[PDB]
């Protein structure tokens, strides 16, 4: 009665995984600064996205099982590794440093944050030796028992971030090969999982800034309206909670020092850049955030939190309960200088369901860093001449509720940045990759004559 | 009257050379053993090979011109070199050693086989000498004229094998690409070359262990119902003769010493493992093979050796001719320690053409090896903790005839490991790679419609 | 009335740019000797090229915008750098050299050309040192404040030239990939730009020797029956002028000294080759060119220069103004040693349009070279023992104009090798690569059957 007919090219897809390839705007070429996330091999992006909107279709998404974030995690590390493959491997610097405190003009709080170190080195000629000095932060030198040594020397040698390549993030687009498509969930209420009433296929994702941060997401994508709380399992106490502000709050971080870069010649053709001296007064690094906006912003976060825990509980915010400096402070880089800001001045409040001082958050700067939770890998950031200042956009917020007493009288939330790939999950949660299945069959009344 | 007609997909093949790719089982993949042969990158194989039998077809075979052997050799070498790249190079070990004989607990025969050596090294800080000592075998040190030096210093620096990776052989399957095929010769009597009445094609070869040995094939395949002898030209004297047993001969090897590994910290993040003190007495290593099951094995071999040499010749066996240690002594590794055994006790007998004593073969251990007859590349196997004992099958044997001055009076056979391909040749002798030729033309009584 | 019909495989092409691959003869690879331009991996060339001559077709050939030169310039650098990767780094050689003048048997001209240097050098063992001596050319040393040092020490270290790889150029063929084509211009008066009535297609270009030189094109391709002048814009002065002799002039370059190579063993697994002493007396290097055949060549060149500058102006030749040795003198590497010949004795003449002295050109040898006018890379060609004699053709000449004082009566031309890619631009001026477009549509009277 019915005969099978084969149709080729029908619009059917299926979830799967592939290897998305890079794509970025050609404006990066004009920079000619050899960005660490090399755009030279990235295919140029299209002049304008072609956002095809699909009518009357629903698809299932899961931002936490998304493979795009996992693939990006590997790519960012791989791009970073390839950059520090041709740069000075600061092996010779493991020598007995003879350091002393600096007390030229020092504030009481900044008593011993940095030291004045002197050590021997080798001129371009092996036979000759030269005595040089440099200023090392107290977080990069440890004592023997005034013998001092670098923290890296008993773990691994640190490469020395080339002084040309730049750490400034630039937008990138992760685009699928032919035979695969990316679906964007335009739904304004899609939290973490479920059928999106509106799904639109796109050529590939928009610009994604690879901004690495802890306890706070900077320069991110804001929600169109309302604040959103994202998590796989709200009840679980050992699960991170992601937030997204509908409006941004600016934070101004500055290093008011006047460090002067000094060049030290070690070996033939290899130079080690170290801080020479300090010009003018010495003041501790800090970040300024307006209390008026933050308290208003924090009030919105509490409003949505009460939805999943009842509209009578007492929501309390507390600082991190422990860990090393990397996980217990807000970490980021601002124009090639890495900050570690004590963020305990923000998460201290209580809500019982009922001027422009610009709150200051003291910060510290580190030169020997890992920033991938890896042992045996390291990098040394040379100093930056003159003062440095930058302004950011605090859009996201990572929190981890902890504790339990069999009583819902109050819930306490603390910042948490254990998972360093959650920065990008907050941007790729709207995307999923599918593979098309053009072949298909369907019975009909057509019969092949011959 | 007939007309040319074309066919596509006909079963026709021609001999060809291609690049077979690896394939290994995933059962042990999750163990994270990190073998020297990167089986993690090998595509998982099918649960069972697709043994397809081809009837009424005879295929020529040549185990000596087969390219599967030559390709395998370069894969093993490439894998071995690829695994030594990340390990630490022991370049700073070339120092004037000051060694003395050890006589704490020594037997008469093992008088000066190892030395107590002391040498000054530099610590993580590159301006402080640290005096350390280690135990070195007599084969890894030479005199200057009281003071010794490592034998490899005047050839090249050596990279020690990382303890994380293991030298345990594991099966690997070589599977050809699409459009090619592999033919298995199922004939039982197929000696070295010629038509194979029973030919079958498989998805790809069975697991082959990359075992490296000399004069004795361990953990190899067994020829059933007979003991086989392979040789491209039996008459030619300078052609290694390969013997494949039908029942394995067990061999037990042990190192009674109980040395304790000692770690020495050199440079940043790099550690060199010394030998450390010896617990208990020191005894020479040895290998045991039962004479009851070995003497009768020779009788089987002699019976087949007479077919190609006459039924009245006198068969004689003598030890190796002599020369370099690696070629004149049975060598292997079990437990990660390389042995070099003296097999003079096995090949010493004569036949006139007509009590588990457990023969013990003394063996010596070497820490500096090349293993590929290569100059400029060396490896340093770190010492293992505790006693090591291994049990293996002798499923094969190699011989090299000598003499021939008399017309036909007697024959003398000696072992020989001159070529390194014989170990894998005995496993790949059943396989041949061919390429398919789907196109074909045959006349028939047919015409085009227009 | 008409219907469009599609034709597949039509003869139509378009200008395009691709990545050509290599093709070399078997003789170079058959020797089994290693070459800097490793043609062993390069695929074998066809037995003969099939130069199909097209008819009635004209193409707009261009040599100044051709990408073949740009691709080949980068390709040559890559192979040259690749061959130096496994060689030995001479970084233990940066020490305070203590040199003195040598006056064993010195010619009047070659007084301070080379110096006798001694220094402290390392040894296989870390705790032992050796004192060695060598003769270094004056161009390779500089006073530290007597105490000298290698010039490259204060820029970058010098990777030694491996002693087996030879710089002997060998012809190579560039073959376009499938789907592309190469067009050859058979016109015998093609001036580099404009329509070429005689066009042909070749699957591979002729063998091009990668000869690197300055001010003179050696071992090139000769024109027939006339001398041709190539230039982007004759009026412009910043643009170089290319000449191509129809007949060659033979130049004999010799190094009369009889240097003796000496091997100094530094560190484990690496050796440094140095120059011991000069058997016999020491004489300056030079090159011989006959006066009779060179005056005629300039007579042909000046005749053609009059077409583009009038038939009454005075044509003058002057030596190079100034600059670095790599640009103000003729350079070449024949016999494995790098020369820098002072060609001021050739370009000194004045023509107003109205015996075998064998001109001798003094040359200075150098051992620390940076061939790819890069900055940072260095190479050290080891000395070659024995007297070396060299014979070469001169089949080209690069010239530059100085300017005009509003009077065309006198015009002076000087040699110049500023850009390294003009050498290969003289061999690829007849070639261009095009893309094959087989799809085409034309109207005919053909209705679809159904």
């Amino acid at each position, epitope marked *: 009665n019915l005969w099978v007919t084969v149709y080729y090219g029908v619009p059917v897809w299926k979830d799967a995984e592939t290897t998305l390839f890079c794509a970025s705007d050609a404006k990066a070429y004009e920079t000619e600064k050899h960005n660490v996330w090399a755009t030279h091999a990235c295919v140029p992006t299209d002049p304008n996205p072609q956002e095809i909107h699909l009518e009357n279709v629903t698809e299932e998404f899961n931002m936490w099982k998304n493979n795009m974030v996992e693939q990006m995690h590997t790519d960012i590390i791989s791009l970073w590794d390839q950059s520090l493959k041709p740069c000075v491997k600061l092996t*010779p610097l493991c*020598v007995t440093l003879q350091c002393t405190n600096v007390t030229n003009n020092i504030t009481d709080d900044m008593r011993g944050e940095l030291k004045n170190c002197s050590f021997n080195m*080798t001129t371009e000629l*092996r036979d000759k030796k030269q005595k040089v000095y440099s200023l090392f932060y107290r977080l990069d030198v440890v004592q023997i028992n005034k013998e001092y040594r670098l923290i890296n020397c008993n773990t691994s040698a640190c490469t020395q971030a080339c002084p040309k390549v730049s750490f400034e993030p630039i937008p990138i687009h992760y685009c699928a090969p032919a035979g695969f498509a990316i679906l964007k969930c335009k739904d304004k209420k899609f939290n973490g999982t479920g059928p999106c009433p509106s799904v639109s296929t796109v050529q590939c994702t928009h610009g994604i800034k690879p901004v690495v941060s802890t306890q706070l997401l900077l320069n991110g994508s804001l929600a169109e309206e309302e604040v959103m709380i994202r998590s796989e399992n709200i009840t679980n106490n050992a699960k991170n909670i992601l937030v997204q502000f509908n409006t941004p709050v600016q934070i101004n971080c500055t290093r008011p020092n006047n460090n002067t870069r000094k060049s030290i010649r070690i070996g033939p053709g290899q130079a080690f850049y170290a801080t020479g001296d300090i010009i003018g007064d010495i003041r501790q690094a800090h970040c300024n955030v307006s209390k008026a906006t933050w308290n208003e912003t924090l009030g919105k976060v509490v409003k949505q939190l009460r939805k999943h825990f009842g509209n009578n509980t007492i929501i309390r915010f507390a600082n991190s309960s422990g860990g090393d400096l990397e996980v217990t402070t807000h970490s980021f880089n601002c124009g090639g200088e890495f900050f570690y800001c004590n963020t305990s001045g923000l998460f201290n409040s209580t809500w019982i369901s009922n001027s422009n001082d610009s709150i200051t958050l003291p910060c510290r700067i580190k030169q020997i860093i890992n920033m991938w939770q890896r042992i045996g890998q390291c990098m040394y950031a040379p100093p930056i001449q003159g003062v440095i200042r930058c302004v950011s956009n605090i859009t996201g917020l990572i929190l981890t509720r902890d504790g339990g007493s069999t009583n819902s009288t109050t819930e306490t939330f603390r910042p948490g940045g254990g998972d360093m790939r959650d920065n990008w999950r907050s941007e790729l949660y709207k995307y999923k990759v599918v593979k098309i299945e053009p072949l298909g069959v369907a019975p009909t009344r057509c019969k092949r004559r011959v | 009257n007939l007309w040319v007609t074309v066919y596509y997909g006909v079963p026709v093949w021609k001999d060809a050379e291609t690049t077979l790719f690896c394939a290994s089982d995933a059962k042990a993949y999750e163990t994270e053993k990190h073998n020297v042969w990167a089986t993690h990158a090998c595509v998982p194989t099918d649960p069972n090979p697709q043994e397809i039998h081809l009837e009424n077809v005879t295929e020529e075979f040549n185990m000596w011109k087969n390219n599967m052997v030559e390709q395998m050799h370069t894969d093993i070498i490439s894998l071995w070199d690829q695994s030594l790249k990340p390990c630490v190079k022991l370049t700073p070990l070339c120092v004037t050693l000051q060694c003395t004989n050890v006589t704490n607990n020594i037997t008469d025969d093992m008088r000066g086989e190892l030395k107590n050596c002391s040498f000054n090294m530099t610590t993580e800080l590159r*301006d402080k*000498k640290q005096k350390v000592y280690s135990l070195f075998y007599r084969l890894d040190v030479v005199q200057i004229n009281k003071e010794y030096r490592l034998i490899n210093c005047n050839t090249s620096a050596c990279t020690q094998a990382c303890p994380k990776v293991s030298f345990e052989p594991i099966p690997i399957h070589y599977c050809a690409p699409a459009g090619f095929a592999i033919l298995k010769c199922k004939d039982k009597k197929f000696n070295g070359t010629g038509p194979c009445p029973s030919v079958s094609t498989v998805q790809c070869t069975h697991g082959i262990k990359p075992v490296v040995s000399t004069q004795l094939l361990l953990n190899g395949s067994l020829a059933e119902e007979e003991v086989m002898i392979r040789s491209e030209n039996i008459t030619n004297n300078a052609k290694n003769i390969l013997v494949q047993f039908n029942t394995p001969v067990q061999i037990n090897c042990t190192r009674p010493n109980n040395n304790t590994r000692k770690s020495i910290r050199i440079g940043p993040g790099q550690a060199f493992y010394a030998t450390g003190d010896i617990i208990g007495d020191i005894r020479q290593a040895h290998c045991n093979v039962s004479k009851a099951t070995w003497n009768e094995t020779l009788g089987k071999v002699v019976k087949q050796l007479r077919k190609h040499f006459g039924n009245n010749t006198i068969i004689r066996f003598a030890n190796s001719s002599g020369g370099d240690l690696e070629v004149t002594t049975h060598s292997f590794n079990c437990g990660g320690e390389f042995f070099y055994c003296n097999t003079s006790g096995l090949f010493n007998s004569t036949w006139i053409s007509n009590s588990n004593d457990s023969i013990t073969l003394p063996c010596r251990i070497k820490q500096i090896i090349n293993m590929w007859q290569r100059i400029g590349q060396c490896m340093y196997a770190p010492p293992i903790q505790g006693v090591i004992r291994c049990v293996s099958n002798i499923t094969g044997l190699i011989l090299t005839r000598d003499g021939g001055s008399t017309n036909s009076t007697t024959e003398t056979f000696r072992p020989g490991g001159g070529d390194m391909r014989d170990n894998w040749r005995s496993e790949l002798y059943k396989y041949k790679v061919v390429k398919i030729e789907p196109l074909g033309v045959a006349p028939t009584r047919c015409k085009r419609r227009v | 009335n008409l219907w469009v019909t599609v034709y597949y495989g039509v003869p139509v092409w378009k200008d395009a740019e691709t990545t050509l691959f290599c093709a070399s003869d078997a003789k170079a690879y058959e020797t089994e000797k290693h070459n800097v331009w490793a043609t062993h991996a390069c695929v074998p060339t066809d037995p003969n090229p099939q130069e199909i001559h097209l008819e009635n077709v004209t193409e707009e050939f261009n040599m100044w915008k051709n990408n073949m030169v740009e691709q080949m310039h980068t390709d040559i650098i890559s192979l040259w750098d690749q061959s130096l990767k496994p060689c030995v780094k001479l970084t233990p050689l940066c020490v305070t050299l203590q040199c003195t003048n040598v006056t064993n048997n010195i010619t009047d001209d070659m007084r301070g050309e080379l110096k006798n240097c001694s220094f402290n050098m390392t040894t296989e063992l*870390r*705790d032992k040192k050796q004192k060695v001596y060598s003769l270094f050319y004056r161009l390779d040393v500089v006073q530290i404040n007597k105490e000298y040092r290698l010039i490259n020490c204060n820029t970058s270290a010098c990777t030694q030239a491996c002693p087996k790889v030879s710089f002997e150029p060998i012809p190579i063929h560039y073959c376009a990939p499938a789907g592309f084509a190469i067009l050859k211009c058979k016109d015998k008066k093609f001036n580099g730009t404009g329509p070429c009535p005689s066009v042909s297609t070749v699957q591979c270009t002729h063998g091009i020797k990668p000869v690197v030189s300055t001010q003179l094109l050696l071992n090139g391709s000769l024109a027939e029956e006339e001398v041709m002048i190539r230039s982007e814009n004759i009026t412009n002065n910043a643009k170089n002028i290319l000449v191509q002799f129809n007949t060659p002039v033979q130049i004999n370059c010799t190094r009369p000294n009889n240097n003796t190579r000496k091997s100094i063993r530094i560190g484990p697994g690496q050796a440094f080759y140095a120059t011991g002493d000069i058997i016999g007396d020491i004489r300056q290097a030079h090159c011989n060119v006959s006066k009779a055949t060179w005056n005629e060549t300039l007579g042909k060149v000046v005749k053609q220069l009059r077409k583009h500058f009038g038939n009454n102006t005075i044509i003058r030749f002057a030596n190079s103004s100034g600059g670095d040795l790599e640009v103000t003198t003729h350079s070449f590497n024949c016999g494995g040693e790098f020369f820098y010949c002072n060609t001021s004795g050739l370009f000194n003449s004045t023509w107003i349009s109205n015996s075998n002295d064998s001109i001798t050109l003094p040359c200075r040898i150098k051992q620390i070279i940076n061939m790819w006018q890069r900055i940072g890379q260095c190479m050290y060609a080891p000395p070659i023992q024995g007297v070396i004699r060299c014979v070469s053709n001169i089949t080209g000449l690069i010239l530059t104009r100085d300017g005009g004082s509003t009077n065309s009566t006198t015009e002076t031309f000087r040699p110049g090798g500023g850009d390294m890619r003009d050498n290969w631009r003289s061999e690829l001026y007849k070639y261009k690569v095009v893309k094959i477009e087989p799809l085409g549509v034309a109207p005919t009277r053909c209705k679809r059957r159904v």
Partner: antibody
Amino acid sequence: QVQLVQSGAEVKKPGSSVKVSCKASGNSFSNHDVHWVRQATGQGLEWMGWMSHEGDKTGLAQKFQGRVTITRDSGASTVYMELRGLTADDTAIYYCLTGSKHRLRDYFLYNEYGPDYEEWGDYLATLDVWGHGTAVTVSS
Amino acid sequence: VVITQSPLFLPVTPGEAASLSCKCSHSLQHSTGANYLAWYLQRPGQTPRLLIHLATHRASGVPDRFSGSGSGTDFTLKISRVESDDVGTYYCMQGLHSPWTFGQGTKVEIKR
């Protein structure tokens, strides 16, 4: 013949601190080493201390450990010495003199890419011209 | 470290050669290897004057009569035509190993 001057003779009771001064014309301390020696009637000479012309390294005998100090003024204009534990048997005559040293290398391990680990040492070569000296006696 | 010299006394007639030797417990070739020897003449009531250093070279202005030789752990000083002007005590000094100390010394008197 370089003229040299020394402080005049002084007498102090046992178990007390004293100060002495010595100066050299031409600032010869820059390129010469200074040692202190004493002599007693019927007995041989005895060395007390020394200083390197670099001024980096100094040393004394094991018996003088923790009881003798050497100080120099800025610019090497003058130097002063401190004496402790005087005894009636310590009668002798002080002297001012220069010296020379032979600084050689005893050991070296060749670090790959970093500063070498060298063990330097000093060996006294000769005693240069002496001065007229100063006589010091202990009595009570 | 200890140092000894001998003989304590040895009368020498004027115009006759004399030999004196000084040694220390540590061998001159103990660790580094070199002489580092110094010879001084102690004129009574006057400062000592260096004669020869290391027994290998003679200081400028010193008479050529003084000479030295020997090897190993023992060395001797050879002087031709001894004169009463050399009467005094001779002290040997070592610079091989710190601390640096003088020898005990010996006295030579003209026979009378």
